[PDB]
Design an enzyme around this catalytic site. Structure first.
Site, PDB file in Angstrom:
ATOM      1  N   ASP A   1      43.101  25.315  35.863  1.00 28.61           N
ATOM      2  CA  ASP A   1      43.346  26.023  35.895  1.00 28.61           C
ATOM      3  C   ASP A   1      43.067  27.459  35.096  1.00 28.61           C
ATOM      4  OD1 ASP A   1      46.285  26.506  38.353  1.00 28.61           O
ATOM      5  OD2 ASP A   1      47.441  27.694  35.919  1.00 28.61           O
TER       6      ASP A   1
ATOM      7  N   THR B   1      43.893  32.224  39.931  1.00 29.06           N
ATOM      8  CA  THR B   1      44.520  32.867  38.514  1.00 29.06           C
ATOM      9  C   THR B   1      43.641  33.204  37.627  1.00 29.06           C
ATOM     10  OG1 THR B   1      45.118  30.555  37.716  1.00 29.06           O
ATOM     11  CG2 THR B   1      46.810  32.015  38.255  1.00 29.06           C
ATOM     12  N   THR B   2      42.378  32.199  38.297  1.00 25.95           N
ATOM     13  CA  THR B   2      40.869  33.043  37.248  1.00 25.95           C
ATOM     14  C   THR B   2      40.082  33.999  38.345  1.00 25.95           C
ATOM     15  OG1 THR B   2      40.785  30.631  36.952  1.00 25.95           O
ATOM     16  CG2 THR B   2      38.609  31.902  36.647  1.00 25.95           C
TER      17      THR B   2
ATOM     18  N   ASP C   1      49.609  24.365  42.365  1.00 26.20           N
ATOM     19  CA  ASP C   1      48.486  25.055  43.416  1.00 26.20           C
ATOM     20  C   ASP C   1      48.857  24.641  44.508  1.00 26.20           C
ATOM     21  OD1 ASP C   1      47.750  26.440  41.312  1.00 26.20           O
ATOM     22  OD2 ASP C   1      46.311  26.142  41.091  1.00 26.20           O
TER      23      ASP C   1
HETATM   24  N1  ADP Z   1      34.511  24.230  49.739  1.00 28.58           N
HETATM   25  C1  ADP Z   1      33.613  25.609  48.554  1.00 28.58           C
HETATM   26  N2  ADP Z   1      32.739  26.765  49.190  1.00 28.58           N
HETATM   27  C2  ADP Z   1      32.319  27.954  48.686  1.00 28.58           C
HETATM   28  N3  ADP Z   1      33.497  28.260  47.911  1.00 28.58           N
HETATM   29  C3  ADP Z   1      34.868  27.882  47.607  1.00 28.58           C
HETATM   30  C4  ADP Z   1      34.731  26.181  47.998  1.00 28.58           C
HETATM   31  N4  ADP Z   1      35.661  25.881  47.550  1.00 28.58           N
HETATM   32  C5  ADP Z   1      36.731  26.751  46.929  1.00 28.58           C
HETATM   33  N5  ADP Z   1      35.347  27.726  46.491  1.00 28.58           N
HETATM   34  C6  ADP Z   1      35.692  29.298  46.055  1.00 28.58           C
HETATM   35  O1  ADP Z   1      35.931  29.057  44.628  1.00 28.58           O
HETATM   36  C7  ADP Z   1      36.880  30.311  44.201  1.00 28.58           C
HETATM   37  C8  ADP Z   1      37.579  29.458  43.277  1.00 28.58           C
HETATM   38  O2  ADP Z   1      39.265  28.671  43.914  1.00 28.58           O
HETATM   39  P1  ADP Z   1      39.809  28.028  42.848  1.00 28.58           P
HETATM   40  O3  ADP Z   1      38.692  27.492  41.203  1.00 28.58           O
HETATM   41  O4  ADP Z   1      40.363  26.838  43.375  1.00 28.58           O
HETATM   42  O5  ADP Z   1      40.538  28.693  42.218  1.00 28.58           O
HETATM   43  P2  ADP Z   1      40.786  30.059  41.305  1.00 28.58           P
HETATM   44  O6  ADP Z   1      40.413  30.760  42.171  1.00 28.58           O
HETATM   45  O7  ADP Z   1      42.242  30.201  40.794  1.00 28.58           O
HETATM   46  O8  ADP Z   1      39.602  30.084  40.837  1.00 28.58           O
HETATM   47  C9  ADP Z   1      37.635  30.720  45.313  1.00 28.58           C
HETATM   48  O9  ADP Z   1      37.212  32.134  46.083  1.00 28.58           O
HETATM   49  C10 ADP Z   1      36.987  30.345  46.211  1.00 28.58           C
HETATM   50  O10 ADP Z   1      35.739  31.397  47.238  1.00 28.58           O
HETATM   51 MG    MG Z   2      42.281  28.089  43.398  1.00 28.22          MG
END
Ligand code: ADP
Ligand code: MG
Ligand code: ADP
Ligand code: MG
Lengths: 540, 98, 525, 49
Positions: A72, A105-106, A403
């Site tokens: 997170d 948040t990232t 989340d």
């Molecule tokens: N199955 C997936 N395939 C491709 N991209 C993904 C997938 N799941 C999440 N993402 C991408 O990873 C990014 C980071 O998401 P996450 O780490 O869950 O939260 P945050 O946006 O706070 O970092 C998101 O912008 C999303 O578009």
């Molecule tokens: Mg996320």
């Protein structure tokens, strides 16, 4: 480059202006801008590795040596021990994104870092930072309009929860609890849908209780449509399970009454002593009888009670629990459908809550007992019980569930979605690029910098997954231009296809809008600062 | 000090309340209005009751003030309201006034 | 110096006398001024000052920056004091005062160096300032029609001008409309405490809202609160100052009994007192109960059982705002809860606002108050937004009092400088140099605007001087076009009192600094 | 009597805006809700209210 000014007058007399000016420091103009940009770039580059399904976690250690492993972004920046003011601004931006949305948040920190990195080159080319901020603002406006354009609606109906399941799975993909991906997503969706006011109103989080106990397995995490209680039955010989329990929630200790006002009861004779003893005994018997007359099966108290009341409750086949917390009392009353009664004189049958099963649960060789109040009729409160092999994954599962609940709450507030994986970022960058061509020359540079900064999320996603960033992003952008499809992103999971609509990578539209808005505002606020006056005292 | 119940019942009957901490200000107000400082909550007799042409709450600059104003060109106490861009300047003007 | 066996003053008494100390004072004033120069105009920047505890503050306001500076030079503190004075009396122009005073001192510095008598300089400043104030009053544009739409447009343009130097300048139209709407609800005194400003972290600037009513954060609800309904479609509000808890009757109350029956009677009497208060509140017909004093869990559960809403420990100012919005009375006693002491609003609702719970009172038709809910990504972001809104609110209040405006962007400064030069050409000559220096110092504002915006100041000043001399009153700096333009037609409008007070305070500070010949600093005790 | 002349210092508008008031000025506020009286009938109490 610091220490403010030092002239000591042209007549040689002392020249003291600001208190302790010889121990203070200051930076002005482009030097301060470059320092801010460098600090923000460092923070964003540290954070960008924790993006996407292939993102990695950060092990955070606090003052007391306690260790939290997390992905997170808001938690990482909150626990990170910064001193730079711009780093504190980044931390506060991440906290703001957590507060308003709960997810992304990232991404906000990475976007802000990319924007300031482009602004560095723009400033080096000789552009006033206010012009850069204005260009960023109007590019963000264009991007937000495009996001509204390319959004899609989903059904938030209870009968079909598949879009909600997909959205929660997309949220949880980056967390460590992806080993129980669909189960965790489904319990989060059910939790949010259960405790929610239907007509697009708020989802109140005090109705969701999140509890984590060590032991068992992470797969043992389950949704309890009731209340889990850290307490147990007061008497050790009370039965460990009540069926069709008619709860009696009370906030009065099972003790003789005591006036709040300062008081003294005078005993002046032996008859007074006998009357006092009989009064105490009859008060105990009367309170037990009053509890029993309503037909209740279980009694829940908040303030505990003494031995005589305990044995009378045991003798009258009335299981009871004491010292239950106020929030737990409220949750039990909400779930069971009963009313909180302040004294036995007001206890009636209609104020009794009903629970299908009240049980005491053991946790192996620990002596620790906890109480389950489940199988309620129309429970309006829900509880999530989390297990795991160690407390650290338990805390991480707690924040991952938070989340997911926040994302489903956002979906309830607004049902419009966009497809993630960098597809939304690429489409917004393309829209900004087309808008920049029609714009006069001066703001074109700011718009192009905004688009290039927007392109960092697909780059980070591709790099974290091992693919070549520039080649993959360029190919996806070319495909998006060739065929009108804003759903093509970065295939982080190597599923074969780039269409995120088919891959069910779904994000809330308001989440992306808040990301872009907050990043733009913080970048403008940093770009407008051209002076620092730190104490520079190096105090202990 | 003013009790909460006393303030409530004064508000109910449309009575303006002023709480002067310093005894000197109370004495000067008694001089300039013509009232007598009663030591009990007894209602004031006709002679002890003070009179003034206007009493109101006003803001001068950014400071809220309570003004006891006489329309007549007379009275026991007259005040000079000094304005200025600096505290030191107003202090010097006050010294000149003295 | 000959060391006397017994000296006059204490050890360590430092005294600076003569022309050098006056020149040092002028230099100190310049040093103070240059710490706020870059924060001037639409292209101005913000300053970040960190206190001893590491709690940084970011602001574009000159008065705030000067206050956060630990200025200890006795002559330099006059600039901070006049900045505070300008903020108090007007609320805008806290930077122009400092730049004008410092520029006056800098212009007269060469004459001070050559032994000119400071009383002559003081008299020249007084004469020039009187003439400039009279000219401002004479040439200020006023609308003698009392038209609603025209006067509202004047307020909105003045607020926009007062706002187009801060980080909310991109949403300046939105915020100026909100500020004007907020100010027009105040009844007769335009008290600041009737305009609530709540800062909620998280969200875009465009998510800020103005509520035609009152809103405040949820205040530590007890157990049983979650069963109270959180939406009412025509509630009656019982504004109270009452502690609804089981407690001692008084701090000095002692109960003496000698029978168990009396003990039970006393307990039942305490319960009956509490329930009598609660029953009177319930029978008053109200649905929402607010109290300055705490409301216990027993009362919360009682009100939940009656489908009523309660909230204890509500801040006093929030209760005053609710009273003004709904039209009730803060009752310290519940014995007479008549229909005329109960507040009334169209809709009451508790909603989630960026990770916090807020109670909303809306639909009040007779409301004399309003509440700002500011959204932002940082605490300092929202604080600077609040400061900017405060500047706009003060500007709108002053415009409400009197609608006399002059064109900003240095147009008024050029007009005054031209008038003062024309006057100075017609005087014997000793005052002529000083009045010309005053007129030249008046040119600081557009020059600083051009410097902050990155223009070439000399060319813009030459063009402005030529335009003013050849005809034209409201011609000033046009930031976007890198040139000059008619600022009155560009709606760069500011109240005349802003410039009037700026000139008056700057002149007074300059005269006070010039009049000083010696500085004596006793050793610290 | 010299003490019958009171001086109130209010910052903001320059000394040319000073004025003489036949009465007194207190830099304070009112406890209650009423903030203006046109025919005042002040009753002064030295005891707590
Ligand atoms: N199955 C997936 N395939 C491709 N991209 C993904 C997938 N799941 C999440 N993402 C991408 O990873 C990014 C980071 O998401 P996450 O780490 O869950 O939260 P945050 O946006 O706070 O970092 C998101 O912008 C999303 O578009
Ligand atoms: Mg996320
Ligand atoms: N749109 C604009 N174009 C040109 N000048 C402006 C504009 N808006 C404000 N100004 C000028 O900027 C000056 C400074 O205003 P501001 O920085 O808001 O407060 P302060 O007067 O306290 O510095 C004003 O004198 C005004 O004339
Ligand atoms: Mg301003």
């Amino acid at each position: 480059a610091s220490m403010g000014t030092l002239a000591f007058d042209e007549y040689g007399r002392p020249f003291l202006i600001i208190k302790d000016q010889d121990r203070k420091s200051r930076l002005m103009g482009l030097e301060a801008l470059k320092s801010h940009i460098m600090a923000a770039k460092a923070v964003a580059n540290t954070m960008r590795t924790s993006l996407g399904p292939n993102g990695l976690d950060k092990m955070m250690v606090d003052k007391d040596g306690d260790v939290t492993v997390t992905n997170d972004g808001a938690t990482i920046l909150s626990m990170m021990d910064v001193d730079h003011q711009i780093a504190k601004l980044m931390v506060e931006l991440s906290k703001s994104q957590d507060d308003e949305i709960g997810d992304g948040t990232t991404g906000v920190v990475v976007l802000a870092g990319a924007l300031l990195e482009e602004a560095e080159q723009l400033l080096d080319r000789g552009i006033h930072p206010i012009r850069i901020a204005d260009g960023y603002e109007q590019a963000a406006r264009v991007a937000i309009e495009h996001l509204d354009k390319i959004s899609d609606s989903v059904l938030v109906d209870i009968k079909d929860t598949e879009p909600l399941i997909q959205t929660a799975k997309t949220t949880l993909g980056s967390k460590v609890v992806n080993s129980c991906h669909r189960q965790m997503a489904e319990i989060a969706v059910n939790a949010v849908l259960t405790v929610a006011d239907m007509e697009r109103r708020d989802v109140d989080f005090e109705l969701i209780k999140v509890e984590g106990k060590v032991g068992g397995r992470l797969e043992d995490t389950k949704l309890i449509k009731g209340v889990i209680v850290d307490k147990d039955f007061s008497h050790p010989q009370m039965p460990k399970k009540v069926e069709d329990a008619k709860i009696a929630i009370l906030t009065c200790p099972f003790e003789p009454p005591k006036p709040k006002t300062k008081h003294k009861l005078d005993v002046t004779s032996v008859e007074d002593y006998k009357a006092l003893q009989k009064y105490e005994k009859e008060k105990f018997e009367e309170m037990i009888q009053q509890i029993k007359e309503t037909g209740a099966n279980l009694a829940i108290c908040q303030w505990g009670f003494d031995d005589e009341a305990n044995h009378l409750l045991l003798q009258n086949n009335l299981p009871a629990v004491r010292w239950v917390g106020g929030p737990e009392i409220e949750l039990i009353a909400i779930a069971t459908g009963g009313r909180i009664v302040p004294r036995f004189s007001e206890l009636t049958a209609e104020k009794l809550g009903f629970a299908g099963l009240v049980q005491e649960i053991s946790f192996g060789t620990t002596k620790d007992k906890m109480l389950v109040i489940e199988q309620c009729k129309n429970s309006r409160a829900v509880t999530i019980f989390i297990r795991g092999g160690n407390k650290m994954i338990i805390e991480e599962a707690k924040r991952s569930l938070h989340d997911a609940l926040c994302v489903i709450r956002n979906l309830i507030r607004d049902n419009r979605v966009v497809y993630g994986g960098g597809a939304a970022e690429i489409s917004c960058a393309l829209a900004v690029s087309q808008e920049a061509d029609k714009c006069p020359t001066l703001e074109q540079y700011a718009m192009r910098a905004f688009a290039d900064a927007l392109e960092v999320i697909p780059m980070a996603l591709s790099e974290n997954s091992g693919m070549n960033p520039i080649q993959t992003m360029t190919e996806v952008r070319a495909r998006q231009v060739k065929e009108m499809n804003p759903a093509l992103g970065i295939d982080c999971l190597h599923k074969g296809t780039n269409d995120m609509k088919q891959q069910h990578v779904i994000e809330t539209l308001i989440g992306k809008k808040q990301q872009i808005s907050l990043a733009t505002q913080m970048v403008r606020m940093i770009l407008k600062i051209d002076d620092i006056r730190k104490p520079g005292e190096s105090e202990e | 000090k003013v009790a909460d119940m006393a303030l409530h019942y004064a508000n109910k009957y449309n009575i303006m309340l002023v709480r002067l901490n310093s005894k000197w200000d109370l004495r000067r107000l008694c001089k300039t209005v013509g009232a007598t400082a009663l030591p009990r909550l007894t209602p004031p007799v006709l002679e002890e009751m003070g009179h003034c042409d206007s009493v109101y709450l006003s803001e001068v600059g950014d400071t809220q003030v309570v003004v006891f104003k006489h329309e007549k060109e007379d009275g026991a106490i007259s005040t000079i309201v000094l304005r200025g861009s600096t505290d030191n300047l107003m202090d010097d003007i006050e010294r000149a006034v003295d | 110096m000959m060391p006397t066996p017994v000296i006059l003053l204490k050890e360590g008494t430092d005294s600076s006398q003569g022309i050098p100390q006056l020149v040092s004072n002028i230099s100190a004033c310049q040093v103070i001024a240059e710490a706020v120069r870059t924060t001037l105009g639409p292209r101005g920047m913000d300053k970040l000052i960190v206190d001893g505890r590491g709690k940084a503050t970011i602001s574009n306001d000159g008065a705030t920056i000067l206050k956060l500076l630990d200025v200890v030079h006795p002559a330099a503190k006059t600039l901070v004091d006049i900045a505070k004075s300008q903020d108090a009396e007007v609320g805008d122009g806290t930077t122009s005062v400092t730049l004008l005073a410092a520029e006056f001192l800098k212009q007269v510095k060469p004459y001070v160096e050559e032994g000119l008598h400071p009383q002559i300089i003081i008299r020249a400043f007084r004469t020039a300032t009187q003439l400039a104030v009279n000219k401002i009053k004479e040439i200020a544009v006023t609308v003698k029609k009392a038209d609603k739409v025209e006067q509202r447009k004047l307020l909105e343009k003045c607020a926009m001008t007062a706002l187009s130097s801060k980080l909310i300048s991109q949403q300046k139209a939105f915020f100026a409309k909100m500020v004007v709407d907020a100010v027009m609800m105040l009844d007769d005194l335009l008290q600041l405490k009737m305009i609530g400003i709540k800062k909620v972290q998280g969200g875009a600037l465009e998510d800020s809202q103005l509520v035609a009513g009152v809103a405040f954060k949820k205040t530590f609800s007890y157990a049983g609160f979650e069963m109270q309904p959180k939406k009412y479609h025509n509630p009656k509000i019982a504004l109270l100052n009452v502690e609804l808890e089981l407690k001692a009757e008084k701090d000095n109350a002692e109960i003496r009994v000698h029978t168990v029956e009396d003990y039970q009677a006393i307990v039942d009497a305490e319960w009956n007192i509490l329930y009598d208060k609660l029953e009177k509140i319930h029978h008053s017909g109200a649905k929402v109960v607010l109290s300055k004093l705490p409301i216990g869990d027993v009362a919360t559960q009682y009100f939940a059982d009656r489908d009523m809403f309660c909230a204890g420990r509500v801040p006093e100012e929030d209760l005053k705002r609710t009273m003004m919005a709904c039209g009730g009375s803060i009752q310290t006693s519940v014995n007479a809860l008549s229909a005329d002491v109960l507040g009334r609003c169209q809709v009451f609702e508790e909603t989630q606002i960026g990770g916090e719970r807020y109670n909303f009172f809306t639909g009040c038709p007779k409301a004399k108050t309003c509440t700002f809910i500011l959204r932002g990504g940082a605490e300092q972001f929202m604080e600077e937004t609040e400061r900017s809104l405060h500047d706009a609110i003060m500007i709108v209040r002053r415009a409400i009092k009197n609608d006399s405006v002059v064109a900003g962007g240095g147009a008024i400064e050029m007009e005054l400088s031209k008038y003062l030069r024309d006057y100075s050409r017609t005087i014997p000559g000793k005052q002529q140099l000083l009045i010309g220096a005053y007129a030249k110092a008046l040119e600081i504002i557009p020059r600083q605007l051009c410097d902050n915006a990155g223009f070439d100041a000399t060319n813009i000043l030459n063009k402005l001087r030529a335009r003013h001399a050849q005809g034209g009153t409201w011609y000033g700096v046009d930031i976007n076009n890198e040139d000059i333009a008619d600022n009155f037609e560009a709606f760069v409008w500011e109240p005349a009192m802003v410039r009037i007070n700026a000139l008056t305070a700057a002149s007074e500070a300059a005269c006070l600094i010039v009049s000083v010949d010696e500085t004596i600093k006793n050793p610290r005790s | 009597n010299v003490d019958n002349i009171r001086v109130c210092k209010i910052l903001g508008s320059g000394i040319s805006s000073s004025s003489v008031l036949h009465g007194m000025v207190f830099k304070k506020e009112t406890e209650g809700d009423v903030t203006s009286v046109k025919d005042a009938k002040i009753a002064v109490y030295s005891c707590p209210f």
